[PDB]
């Protein structure tokens, strides 16, 4: 399948942004495969509000890191094996009741419990970058992620309202 570059040159902005109708979402999970040699960066960001209702999955020292900030929880957590070995890795992020689960290469490596209540009309998903300055993170990192993404599925496509790209998407071909 066709893979895309996760950063556009400088890596100061997402390669793509998707907007969703929260009330229409039935599928509360996302999946994709990523390949990279970069130990730090944003794989994807999501929010309903950039100020007080956001989430980020990235890499720090080659391993998955999740930062999350909402009414119920505020945290910075690293988990799972290193993924900056240049191999393709299957990744799934799911909402299971009030928790968020992260599975890597078929194995559950992290479950953040009691982090989300009810389900805020819209949710945004940005790939390879944030929708606010890096300095705004609970724990800053340099967002640029030099890697490839493919076979990605984001939430509920039927609930997708729109998709934007700062610049044209570059293939990892």
Chain-centroid distance, C-alpha 94: 11
Nearer CB in complex with Zn ion: 53/98:
53
Q: In the range 6-65, which residues lie near Ca ion by CB under 5 A?
A: 38, 40-41
Q: In the range 92-121, which residues lie near ligand NOG by CB under 6 A?
A: 93-95, 100, 115-116, 119
Question: Residue 19: which of ligand NOG, a second copy, Zn ion, none does it interact with, CB under 5 to 8 A by kind?
Answer: none
Nearer CB in complex with a second copy: 113/120:
113
Rounded Cα gap, residues 90 and 81, in angstroms = 12
Selected from 53, 108, 152, 160, the binder of Zn ion by CB under 5 A is 53
Sole window of 43-51, 75-83, 144-152, 158-166 interacting with ligand NOG (rule: CB under 6 A): 43-51
Q: In the range 44-73, which residues lie near ligand NOG by CB under 6 A?
A: 46-48, 53-55, 68, 70
Contacts of 130 (CB under 8 A, 6+ apart): 14, 42, 45, 56, 136, 137, 143
Rounded Cα gap, residues 51 and 37, in angstroms = 31
Rounded Cα gap, residues 42 and 92, in angstroms = 15
3-state secondary structure of 137: coil
């Amino acid at each position: 399948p066709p893979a895309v570059h996760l950063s556009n040159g400088p890596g100061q902005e997402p390669i793509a942004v998707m907007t969703f109708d929260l009330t229409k979402i039935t599928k509360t999970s996302s999946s994709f495969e990523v390949r990279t040699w970069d130990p730090e960066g944003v794989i994807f960001y999501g929010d309903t509000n950039p100020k007080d209702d956001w989430f980020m999955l990235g890499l720090r020292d080659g391993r998955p890191e999740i930062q999350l900030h909402n009414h119920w929880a505020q945290l910075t957590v690293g988990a799972g094996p290193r993924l900056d070995d240049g191999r393709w890795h299957q990744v799934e992020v799911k909402m299971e009741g009030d928790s968020v689960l992260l599975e890597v290469d078929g194995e559950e490596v992290l479950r953040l419990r009691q982090v989300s209540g009810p389900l805020h009309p819209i949710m945004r998903i940005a790939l390879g970058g944030l929708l606010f300055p890096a300095s705004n993170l609970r724990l800053p990192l340099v967002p640029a992620l030099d890697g490839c993404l493919r076979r990605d599925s984001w939430l509920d496509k039927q609930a997708e309202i729109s998709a934007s790209a700062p610049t044209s998407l570059r293939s990892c071909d």
